[PDB]
Amino acid sequence: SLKLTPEAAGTFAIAPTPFHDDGKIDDVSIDRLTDFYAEVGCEGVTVLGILGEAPKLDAAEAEAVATRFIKRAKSMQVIVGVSAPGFAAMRRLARLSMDAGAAGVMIAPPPSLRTDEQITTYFRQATEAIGDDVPWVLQDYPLTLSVVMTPKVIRQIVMDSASCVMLKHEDWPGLEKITTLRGFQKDGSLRPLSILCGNGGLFLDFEMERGADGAMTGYCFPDMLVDVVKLSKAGQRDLAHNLFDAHLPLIRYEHQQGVGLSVRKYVLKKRGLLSSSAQRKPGASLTDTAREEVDYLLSRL
Amino acid sequence: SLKLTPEAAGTFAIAPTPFHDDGKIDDVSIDRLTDFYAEVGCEGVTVLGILGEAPKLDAAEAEAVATRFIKRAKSMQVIVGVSAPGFAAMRRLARLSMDAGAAGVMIAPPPSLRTDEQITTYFRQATEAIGDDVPWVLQDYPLTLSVVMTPKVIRQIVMDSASCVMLKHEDWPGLEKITTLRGFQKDGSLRPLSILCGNGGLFLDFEMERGADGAMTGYCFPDMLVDVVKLSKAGQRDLAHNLFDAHLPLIRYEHQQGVGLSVRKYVLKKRGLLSSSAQRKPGASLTDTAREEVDYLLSRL
Amino acid sequence: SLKLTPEAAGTFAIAPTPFHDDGKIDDVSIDRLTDFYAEVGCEGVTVLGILGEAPKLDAAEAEAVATRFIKRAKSMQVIVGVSAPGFAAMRRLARLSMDAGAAGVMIAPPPSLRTDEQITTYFRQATEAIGDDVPWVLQDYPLTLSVVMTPKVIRQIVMDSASCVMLKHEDWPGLEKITTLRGFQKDGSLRPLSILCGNGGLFLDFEMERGADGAMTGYCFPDMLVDVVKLSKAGQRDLAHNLFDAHLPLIRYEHQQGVGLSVRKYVLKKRGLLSSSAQRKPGASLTDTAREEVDYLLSRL
Amino acid sequence: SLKLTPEAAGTFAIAPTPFHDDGKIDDVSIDRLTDFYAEVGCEGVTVLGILGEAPKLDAAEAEAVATRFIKRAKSMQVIVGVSAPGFAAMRRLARLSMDAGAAGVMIAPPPSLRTDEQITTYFRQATEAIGDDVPWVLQDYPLTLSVVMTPKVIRQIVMDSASCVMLKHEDWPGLEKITTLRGFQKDGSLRPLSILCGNGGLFLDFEMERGADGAMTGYCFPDMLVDVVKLSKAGQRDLAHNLFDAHLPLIRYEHQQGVGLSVRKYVLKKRGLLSSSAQRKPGASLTDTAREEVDYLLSRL
Incomplete structure (x- = not known):
C-alpha cells in the first residue's frame, strides 16, 4: 500500500509474465516468482510492459496479471508498466493498478518523439492522463525506444x-x-x-x-x-566487481534482443520458478545449441 | 452481412471517430457520417485505426464505435482496422467486428519489420490469430509505417x-x-x-x-x-483529371501529417456532418490562419 | 562575387548535374541550364548536394561542376551544397567554392541528430569548419533527412x-x-x-x-x-493560386522520391536544356507509361 | 601482395587512424601500430572506415593512410574499408588500395536499404563499381547500419x-x-x-x-x-572462456557507441602504441572518471 518515493533503492526485479505452453497465464508461477523475489532481498517488482510481454495480452489479462503480482508482493513495492499507444488505455491501467495496491507506474515515450519540445510535452500529457497523484517512473531506454x-x-x-x-x-x-x-x-x-x-x-x-x-x-x-x-x-x-564479473558472461548473453526473453524464461524454469518457459507469439525458444551454451555459462557460475 | 471479396471496388470512405469537445464519442455524428457516405455512392467504410484515432480510445470504446458504424451501414461493406501491438487484442477486435456484421478487417505491419522474411512471417501469424475465415486487407503505407x-x-x-x-x-x-x-x-x-x-x-x-x-x-x-x-x-x-485537379489543392493541403486530421474534421463539421471537429489528446486544431487557408481552397472548389 | 545575404529573395533554381549516357559530366548542358535560369528571372542557383547527385561524383568532379556553374552564372548568386560525412571534406569544398565565386554554401544535418543539443552543437562545429566568414544556408528537410x-x-x-x-x-x-x-x-x-x-x-x-x-x-x-x-x-x-494550381498536378508528380529526378531530367531534356536525361548509378529512368503520364500533365499545362 | 581468400582466418586488427592533437595524421604511430599487430600474431589489418574515422579525413588523407598501412604490413593482409555515399568514390579508393598492395576491400550497405531486393541489387552495383576482380568483405552490422x-x-x-x-x-x-x-x-x-x-x-x-x-x-x-x-x-x-571472461569487462566497456573510440585510443596510447589519443571533430575524450574506470578494469586484467 506504500507509494513509490524518490528514496526507492536496492534491487527491483522485472518480472516476466509466466505462461504455459497453450499460452494461458500461469498464476501459480506468478506467486512462486513473487515469493522468490521477496525471499532473496528484492525491494520491488516491475510488471507488464515489454519484458512482461504485455503487448501479447488483452486488456483483461494485463489487469489480472498486474493484480496478481500486486496482491502477492505484500512486503514489496510493485511498479506497473503503463506505456501505451493512447492515454485512455494508460489511464485505465494506471488507476486500476493503483486501486489494486501498486506503488506506482512506469511510462516510456512513444518511439516517434524527437525534439525535446515533443518529449516534455508528451509527459505533461501523460501525467495529466494518469493523474498528478500517481507516482511514476520515467523509462529512458534509447536502444529499444529510439528516443x-x-x-x-x-x-x-x-x-x-x-x-x-x-x-x-x-x-x-x-x-x-x-x-x-x-x-x-x-x-x-x-x-x-x-x-x-x-x-x-x-x-x-x-x-x-x-x-x-x-x-x-x-x-x-x-x-x-x-x-x-x-x-x-x-x-x-x-x-x-568480482561478483559482477562472474555474472557478466551470462548477463551479456541474456542481453540480446529477442533471445533475451528466451534465455530468462529458460533459466527461471531451470531454477524451478516457472512451470514452463513458454512465451506467446511472436516469440521463439532457444535452439538446442543456445541452451547448451547457456548451460555452460551457468556451470561456470 | 456480406463478406469483403477481391471484387470490391469503387470508393471506400475512411471514417474519423466523431468526438465532442469533452472527448466523448459522438454517436449522432457517426450515424450522420454513415448516412452521408451511403447517400453519395460510397461502396464501403473503413473504421478505427490511426485515422479513426483508435489509439486514443480504450478497448470498450473501439468496439462500440466499430459496432455503431457496422450496424448503421446496412447497405455498405464496413472494414475494421485491427492492427495492434499484439495478436490477442487483434483477435478480439477482429472476431467481435465480424460477429457484429463487418465485411472484413485491415492489418498493417508493425513498424519494425525489415526483412521480407519477417514481413511474410508476421502476416502468417496475423492470419492465424484472427482466423483464416476472416477476409482481410493488407495495408501498404511506407510513409507512416516505415515497412x-x-x-x-x-x-x-x-x-x-x-x-x-x-x-x-x-x-x-x-x-x-x-x-x-x-x-x-x-x-x-x-x-x-x-x-x-x-x-x-x-x-x-x-x-x-x-x-x-x-x-x-x-x-x-x-x-x-x-x-x-x-x-x-x-x-x-x-x-x-479535370475534376481531380480541381480538388488537388485541397487534397494536398489535407495530406499533411498531424494537420491532416484537423483539416478533415474542420471541413466535415463545416459540411454539417460532425457536431464538433474535436480530436482526443494528443492532437491540435487548426490555427485561425490555417482555417482561412482551408476556407480559401474550399471557396475555389 | 556577391555574398549571399539575409535579404536574398525571389526564385533560386536547384540545378541537377547534367550527365551523358556514359555518365560523364555534360558541361555544355551546365552552361545551357545556367543561361536558362538567368533568362527566366531566377535570382540564384543551388548546385551539387543530393539533387545534383553529388554523392555519385568524386571529389574532383564535384569541384569542377560547382566551378562551372559559378563561373557561368555571372549575374546570379550560386549556392553550393557542402553537406558531408565529415568536416574536412566540407571545409575543402566550401573554401574552394567561395574562392571560385560562390555566394555561399548550404549545410544539412547528418540523419542521426535527435536532441536539440546535438543539433545546435553540430552546426557550431560545422561553421567552425568552413569558417565564420562563409555565408551559409540551413537546410530543414525532415522528410528525407529525418532530423x-x-x-x-x-x-x-x-x-x-x-x-x-x-x-x-x-x-x-x-x-x-x-x-x-x-x-x-x-x-x-x-x-x-x-x-x-x-x-x-x-x-x-x-x-x-x-x-x-x-x-x-x-x-x-x-x-x-x-x-x-x-x-x-x-x-x-x-x-x-490559379497559376500554382495549374502546375500542382506536375509539381506533385515530380515530388516523388527517386522518380522525382527522373521526371525533372526527362522534362528538362524535352525542353532542350539537357542533351541527355541520364543519371549515374544508382538511378532508374522513367518507364514508358510514366513518360506518357508526364507528357499528359505537360499537355494540360 | 596476396589477395584475400575465403580461407582467411585468425585475428584481423581494426586499426584506428592515429592523430596528434592538432588533428594531423600521426604516421609514426601508424607504423608502430602495424609492427605491433604483426608482432602479436595478427593475420591482417582493416583500415579506414568508421572506426578509422575515415569520414573525418579528406580524399587525399584517406588514400595516404590506407597506403601507409598497406606498405608497412608486408607480412599481413590489409583490408581497406571503401563504403561510401557513391560508387565513384568507392571505385577510386578501391582501385588505389589494390594497386598499393591491399588484400581486398570492405563494403557496408547504405543505412536506407530495407527490402532484400534493394540489398542484393546494391551489392551487384557495388561490385560492378570496384570491379569483379577485387576481393571484398561484406559487413553485416545492423546495430549501427540499421540494415x-x-x-x-x-x-x-x-x-x-x-x-x-x-x-x-x-x-x-x-x-x-x-x-x-x-x-x-x-x-x-x-x-x-x-x-x-x-x-x-x-x-x-x-x-x-x-x-x-x-x-x-x-x-x-x-x-x-x-x-x-x-x-x-x-x-x-x-x-x-577463462581468458575471454577476464577480458569481457573491458570488452564491454569499450563496446559503447562514441565512447568506444575514446577508450581504444586512450588504452593504445597507454600501451605506447599511439603518441596521442586524439580524435578529429566530432569526437570527445574520456572524462577523468571514465579514465579511472578504464584504469580499474586494466588493473584487474
Whole structure:
C-alpha cells in the first residue's frame, strides 16, 4: 500500500509474465516468482510492459496479471508498466493498478518523439492522463525506444511533474548521465529522484559507483545482483566487481534482443520458478545449441 | 452481412471517430457520417485505426464505435482496422467486428519489420490469430509505417493466405507497383485481388489508369472522389483529371501529417456532418490562419 | 562575387548535374541550364548536394561542376551544397567554392541528430569548419533527412552563428513554422533571415502568404514559379493560386522520391536544356507509361 | 601482395587512424601500430572506415593512410574499408588500395536499404563499381547500419558475386546466423566463405564455437584475442572462456557507441602504441572518471 518515493533503492526485479505452453497465464508461477523475489532481498517488482510481454495480452489479462503480482508482493513495492499507444488505455491501467495496491507506474515515450519540445510535452500529457497523484517512473531506454533524452530534458520532465519519483536509467552509454543528474541535485536544480539502472545490467558495476540507487533488472539471477548492489553501497569495490564479473558472461548473453526473453524464461524454469518457459507469439525458444551454451555459462557460475 | 471479396471496388470512405469537445464519442455524428457516405455512392467504410484515432480510445470504446458504424451501414461493406501491438487484442477486435456484421478487417505491419522474411512471417501469424475465415486487407503505407513491401512480397503474403482479399495501396511512389501486381495476375502467379488506393488520394488520377479498383479515402469530399473513380472507369480521362485537379489543392493541403486530421474534421463539421471537429489528446486544431487557408481552397472548389 | 545575404529573395533554381549516357559530366548542358535560369528571372542557383547527385561524383568532379556553374552564372548568386560525412571534406569544398565565386554554401544535418543539443552543437562545429566568414544556408528537410528542428532550435542555430543568412524551408507540415519564425523577428529575438521554400514546391502558394521570401526549387518549370513568387508578392492571390494550381498536378508528380529526378531530367531534356536525361548509378529512368503520364500533365499545362 | 581468400582466418586488427592533437595524421604511430599487430600474431589489418574515422579525413588523407598501412604490413593482409555515399568514390579508393598492395576491400550497405531486393541489387552495383576482380568483405552490422540481412540474403550476395570472399559478422543476436551459413556450405548452396566476427568481440567466445574463422577486432588487446581465437580452435573450451571472461569487462566497456573510440585510443596510447589519443571533430575524450574506470578494469586484467 506504500507509494513509490524518490528514496526507492536496492534491487527491483522485472518480472516476466509466466505462461504455459497453450499460452494461458500461469498464476501459480506468478506467486512462486513473487515469493522468490521477496525471499532473496528484492525491494520491488516491475510488471507488464515489454519484458512482461504485455503487448501479447488483452486488456483483461494485463489487469489480472498486474493484480496478481500486486496482491502477492505484500512486503514489496510493485511498479506497473503503463506505456501505451493512447492515454485512455494508460489511464485505465494506471488507476486500476493503483486501486489494486501498486506503488506506482512506469511510462516510456512513444518511439516517434524527437525534439525535446515533443518529449516534455508528451509527459505533461501523460501525467495529466494518469493523474498528478500517481507516482511514476520515467523509462529512458534509447536502444529499444529510439528516443534520446538529455540530462536537462530529464530534469525538466521531473521538475514539470508533481509525481515523477524515479528514472529507470537504461541509456547506453549512460554513465556520465548519472553523474550529470546527481550534479543537478547538488546544485539544487533537481529535486530528490531515485535512479535504478537497466539495459540488462550491462554496466551495473560502474553505475553504482556513479551514484545510482540500485537496479531494476530482468536478469535471471536478481538474487545475485542484490549482492552486487549491496557490495557496491558498502564501498567494497573489488568484491562488488568480482561478483559482477562472474555474472557478466551470462548477463551479456541474456542481453540480446529477442533471445533475451528466451534465455530468462529458460533459466527461471531451470531454477524451478516457472512451470514452463513458454512465451506467446511472436516469440521463439532457444535452439538446442543456445541452451547448451547457456548451460555452460551457468556451470561456470 | 456480406463478406469483403477481391471484387470490391469503387470508393471506400475512411471514417474519423466523431468526438465532442469533452472527448466523448459522438454517436449522432457517426450515424450522420454513415448516412452521408451511403447517400453519395460510397461502396464501403473503413473504421478505427490511426485515422479513426483508435489509439486514443480504450478497448470498450473501439468496439462500440466499430459496432455503431457496422450496424448503421446496412447497405455498405464496413472494414475494421485491427492492427495492434499484439495478436490477442487483434483477435478480439477482429472476431467481435465480424460477429457484429463487418465485411472484413485491415492489418498493417508493425513498424519494425525489415526483412521480407519477417514481413511474410508476421502476416502468417496475423492470419492465424484472427482466423483464416476472416477476409482481410493488407495495408501498404511506407510513409507512416516505415515497412516497405515489394510486389513479390505482397504476392507471397496474399498467396500464403486463405483470405487476404484486398491491398490498400499507399506506396509512394507506387504507380509501378500497381502495374506490376496486375501483371502477376495476368501471368497467373497472383489470384484475384482488390486494390484500393490511399496516401491521401495524392495519385488517385493515375492510380485508376494503372488499374486500381478504386479508392479508400479519408478525403473530406469522398462524394467527389466517387465521381473521379467513376469518370476514370468510364475512360473519360480529361473529365476525370479535370475534376481531380480541381480538388488537388485541397487534397494536398489535407495530406499533411498531424494537420491532416484537423483539416478533415474542420471541413466535415463545416459540411454539417460532425457536431464538433474535436480530436482526443494528443492532437491540435487548426490555427485561425490555417482555417482561412482551408476556407480559401474550399471557396475555389 | 556577391555574398549571399539575409535579404536574398525571389526564385533560386536547384540545378541537377547534367550527365551523358556514359555518365560523364555534360558541361555544355551546365552552361545551357545556367543561361536558362538567368533568362527566366531566377535570382540564384543551388548546385551539387543530393539533387545534383553529388554523392555519385568524386571529389574532383564535384569541384569542377560547382566551378562551372559559378563561373557561368555571372549575374546570379550560386549556392553550393557542402553537406558531408565529415568536416574536412566540407571545409575543402566550401573554401574552394567561395574562392571560385560562390555566394555561399548550404549545410544539412547528418540523419542521426535527435536532441536539440546535438543539433545546435553540430552546426557550431560545422561553421567552425568552413569558417565564420562563409555565408551559409540551413537546410530543414525532415522528410528525407529525418532530423526535426523546432523554430526555437532554428533561431538558436542562426543567432549562434556569425553568418547563417538563410533557411531553406522544407518542413512538412511547415506553414506555421514560417509564421513563428517571422514572429521571432518581430519580437526581436531573431535577426534578418532569408526564407526560401522547398519540399518540391508542394506548399509554395501558402508559404509565400506566410511570409517566405521566395523559393529554392528543383521543379522543371522554375520559370513559372518565378511568376508564382512575383504574383504572390504583388498580393494577387487569385492569380498566384490559379497559376500554382495549374502546375500542382506536375509539381506533385515530380515530388516523388527517386522518380522525382527522373521526371525533372526527362522534362528538362524535352525542353532542350539537357542533351541527355541520364543519371549515374544508382538511378532508374522513367518507364514508358510514366513518360506518357508526364507528357499528359505537360499537355494540360 | 596476396589477395584475400575465403580461407582467411585468425585475428584481423581494426586499426584506428592515429592523430596528434592538432588533428594531423600521426604516421609514426601508424607504423608502430602495424609492427605491433604483426608482432602479436595478427593475420591482417582493416583500415579506414568508421572506426578509422575515415569520414573525418579528406580524399587525399584517406588514400595516404590506407597506403601507409598497406606498405608497412608486408607480412599481413590489409583490408581497406571503401563504403561510401557513391560508387565513384568507392571505385577510386578501391582501385588505389589494390594497386598499393591491399588484400581486398570492405563494403557496408547504405543505412536506407530495407527490402532484400534493394540489398542484393546494391551489392551487384557495388561490385560492378570496384570491379569483379577485387576481393571484398561484406559487413553485416545492423546495430549501427540499421540494415538487416538474413542468412539467405547473405548467401545470395556471395553467390551473385565473383569475389566476395568474407563476411564480417557483427549481427546481434548473430550466433544462429553463423550456424545457418555453415549449414548452407554443408548442403552445397554456399561456396567457401571466411567469417570473421565483430560487434566489439562481445560474443567471440561462442562465435568461435559456432564455426567462425576468427575475429576482426578493434579491441585494445588484439594480442589477447589472438590467444582466445587460438585456444578456441584448439578445442580448449575452458581455457578459451577463462581468458575471454577476464577480458569481457573491458570488452564491454569499450563496446559503447562514441565512447568506444575514446577508450581504444586512450588504452593504445597507454600501451605506447599511439603518441596521442586524439580524435578529429566530432569526437570527445574520456572524462577523468571514465579514465579511472578504464584504469580499474586494466588493473584487474
